[PDB]
Scaffold this active site. Structure first.
Site, PDB file in Angstrom:
ATOM      1  N   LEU B  70       0.908  -1.131   0.000  1.00  0.00           N
ATOM      2  CA  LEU B  70       0.000   0.000   0.000  1.00  0.00           C
ATOM      3  C   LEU B  70       0.946   1.179   0.000  1.00  0.00           C
ATOM      4  CD1 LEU B  70      -2.797  -0.665   2.646  1.00  0.00           C
ATOM      5  CD2 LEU B  70      -2.967  -0.632   0.147  1.00  0.00           C
ATOM      6  N   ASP B  71       0.642   2.194  -0.800  1.00  0.00           N
ATOM      7  CA  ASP B  71       1.502   3.367  -0.863  1.00  0.00           C
ATOM      8  C   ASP B  71       1.488   4.149   0.445  1.00  0.00           C
ATOM      9  OD1 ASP B  71       2.483   2.979  -3.498  1.00  0.00           O
ATOM     10  OD2 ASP B  71       0.562   3.697  -4.300  1.00  0.00           O
ATOM     11  N   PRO B  72       2.520   4.976   0.671  1.00  0.00           N
ATOM     12  CA  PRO B  72       2.648   5.782   1.887  1.00  0.00           C
ATOM     13  C   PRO B  72       1.379   6.486   2.351  1.00  0.00           C
ATOM     14  CG  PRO B  72       4.632   5.945   0.618  1.00  0.00           C
ATOM     15  CD  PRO B  72       3.613   5.277  -0.274  1.00  0.00           C
ATOM     16  N   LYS B  73       0.730   7.203   1.442  1.00  0.00           N
ATOM     17  CA  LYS B  73      -0.481   7.947   1.767  1.00  0.00           C
ATOM     18  C   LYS B  73      -1.727   7.090   1.937  1.00  0.00           C
ATOM     19  CE  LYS B  73       1.206  11.829  -1.067  1.00  0.00           C
ATOM     20  NZ  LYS B  73       0.862  12.834  -2.119  1.00  0.00           N
ATOM     21  N   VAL B  74      -1.677   5.840   1.484  1.00  0.00           N
ATOM     22  CA  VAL B  74      -2.832   4.952   1.569  1.00  0.00           C
ATOM     23  C   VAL B  74      -2.967   4.220   2.906  1.00  0.00           C
ATOM     24  CG1 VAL B  74      -4.073   3.055   0.452  1.00  0.00           C
ATOM     25  CG2 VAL B  74      -2.621   4.609  -0.905  1.00  0.00           C
TER      26      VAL B  74
END
Ligand code: ZN
Ligand code: ZN
Lengths: 53, 311, 53, 311
Positions: B70-74
């Site tokens: 999952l990406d950093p902001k997700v």
């Protein structure tokens, strides 16, 4: 911006859940930090809400 | 696509030794953790790698790994396999995923148009070609569109939103993203946070209460719930645990619809995960034939001591 | 690694202040976050330690 | 170098109108904030810019600015000027600074050697040429050296540590840095944290208690405490407030040792900061002469209404 109702778990952008009528909260868990200054505090709330002493 | 597959019994008389192994959910706490997977609600900010690092520190582990970056902001569902089960996240690579996303349109678009266009994006999309199982619009407020989307593994939501913006003619930006489901992991009682883990580990290590940490970690078997399975005899478990490939004679029962090349989970008669592998033949062949390699084992999870080879 | 004693404000790397004899704390203020979940909580501690109600 | 400078009175009869302006520390709360400076303890992590952004949000301000950028990982004294006083941080550019730093040696060095070498770094150093006023070793544990250092403005501690490592022959790395002083700002009762500000602002805006927010913000005059000053007549305040340069006839008293080119603070007879400027003549010339421009005003802080021009 993405919020959720603690009750039905409905996702919404609104401050008040549309299907239940309650203040919604940000749909994501709190930021984490290695410090955790209130760790003992919140544990006391759980340790009491679960009945541990 | 998580509909119970049919089970075909090859050996109706097969029985298992109650002394060998353990029912997946009845493992001593240490073992439970050694072969557990956490259904973690990743907080926005840190990378998935960093989150796993935190989990290893909190639970005093040596190894751990996440399934589906999952990406950093997700935020949202982040399955994290622990210690000996670390590699079980491989069973999640083909798992479908669900997300809740906030799309911001760069220009005004009528609500009726938005709903029609986002209705046409359900199905095949190219970003190369992936499938969108469903797009459910939760709310629409001017340029902001909050929607839930089910997608095939490997589907990029940011790209999906970009294409929806192109279709609307005004362009769109993904303002926020939250994964609500990854294969068998979803927002249910098993979803836990890093703070939950810290506190439950404390209740266990300081107060001697394992109940909460136990409930906070699922048996690794949870990760292969959506995979086709092959159940084997106790003797075959020992052979596979010692590095051998699974042969037809060791099969007791299996799911229908398995075909050569498919990723399958080899299970003991107690439903413990033995190993992940690539099927070498189809369900029908495994039932008909009486010899040959049925599965090319790629990763073994079962320790050699649970179903020991005794000479 | 850099720590300070809440008392004399001595900077040290040790867990226990060398000149006073007390558990030292990290020589830097807590991380800040726009969330501040315990804001109401700590304010109640101050609002009570200062006498405000 | 913060030793009280001598004051020379040019006009012994000058008096000030008690109705005009305010004693710096007796300003109505709103004005106090409009012309205030915060002695903030920057937390490690965010950049100084980000910290200032947070301060503007917390105090619902339009403008704010920091003096002496502290790097992301560095914590400690971070003067943040607010609203109308924003530019007063310029008075801090030449201010000396003190830090507490943790140096990690890359090789074993005898404690006696470390102390001797770090004793020789006191004074001029080139990183181009800056002065180290003092290096006080707090603790030494093997390869870790905790020390306090006073330095001239613009001295890079990381470079200082690098050079100390070169001198020791083993090399050194700056593991942690905390600013403990910047000009007149130091770790005393006025040092506050972002959480302090949030809570004090709440006590003010919700509970109607201004006491704490007031104490959490210092009058902008605090920022020029280490600068040479020139005190002027009320009439000269109006002229300077309206954009004029300061002329000799407007001077009541001033610090000794001022010389052409020096950054000076122009003050009202109530010790309010009127403006920052570059001295055009020396203290002696300002006392001897009776005309001419004494200071080239670079920035005015005093609003036009406190000491109004009345025709
Ligand atoms: Zn609801
Ligand atoms: Zn002390």
């Amino acid at each position: 911006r993405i919020r959720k109702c603690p009750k039905c778990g409905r996702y919404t952008l609104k401050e008040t859940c549309p299907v239940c009528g309650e203040k919604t909260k940000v749909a994501h868990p709190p930021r984490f930090s290695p410090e955790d200054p209130y760790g003992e505090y919140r544990r006391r709330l759980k340790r009491e809400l679960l009945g541990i002493g | 696509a998580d509909i119970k597959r049919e089970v075909i019994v090859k050996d109706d008389k097969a029985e298992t030794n109650p002394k060998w192994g353990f029912p997946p959910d009845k493992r001593p706490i240490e073992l439970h953790i050694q072969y557990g997977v956490i259904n973690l609600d990743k907080p926005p900010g840190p990378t998935s790698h960093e989150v796993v690092a935190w989990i290893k520190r909190i639970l005093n582990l040596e190894k751990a790994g996440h399934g589906g970056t999952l990406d950093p902001k997700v935020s949202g569902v982040l399955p994290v396999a622990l210690e000996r089960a670390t590699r079980v996240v491989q069973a999640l690579l083909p798992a479908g995923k669900e997300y809740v996303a906030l799309m911001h349109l760069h220009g005004d678009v009528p609500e009726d148009k938005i709903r029609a266009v986002m209705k046409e994006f359900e199905g095949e999309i190219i970003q190369r070609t992936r499938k969108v199982y469903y797009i459910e619009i939760l709310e629409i407020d001017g340029r902001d569109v909050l929607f839930r989307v089910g997608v095939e593994a490997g589907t990029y939501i940011r790209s999906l939103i970009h294409h929806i913006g192109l279709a609307l003619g005004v362009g769109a930006h993904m303002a926020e993203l939250r994964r609500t489901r990854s294969g068998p992991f979803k927002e249910d009682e098993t979803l836990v946070t890093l703070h939950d883990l810290v506190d439950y580990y404390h209740f266990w290590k300081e107060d001697g209460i394992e109940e909460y940490i136990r409930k906070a970690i699922q048996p690794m078997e949870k990760a292969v719930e959506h995979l086709p399975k092959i159940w084997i005899k106790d003797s075959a478990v020992a052979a596979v645990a010692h590095g051998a490939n699974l042969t037809v004679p060791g099969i007791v029962k299996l799911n229908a619809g398995i075909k050569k090349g498919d990723l399958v989970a080899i299970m003991t008669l107690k439903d413990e995960l033995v190993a992940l592998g690539k099927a070498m033949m189809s369900t029908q062949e495994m039932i008909e034939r009486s010899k040959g390699i049925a599965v090319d084992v790629e990763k073994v999870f079962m320790p050699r001591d649970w179903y020991p080879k005794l000479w």
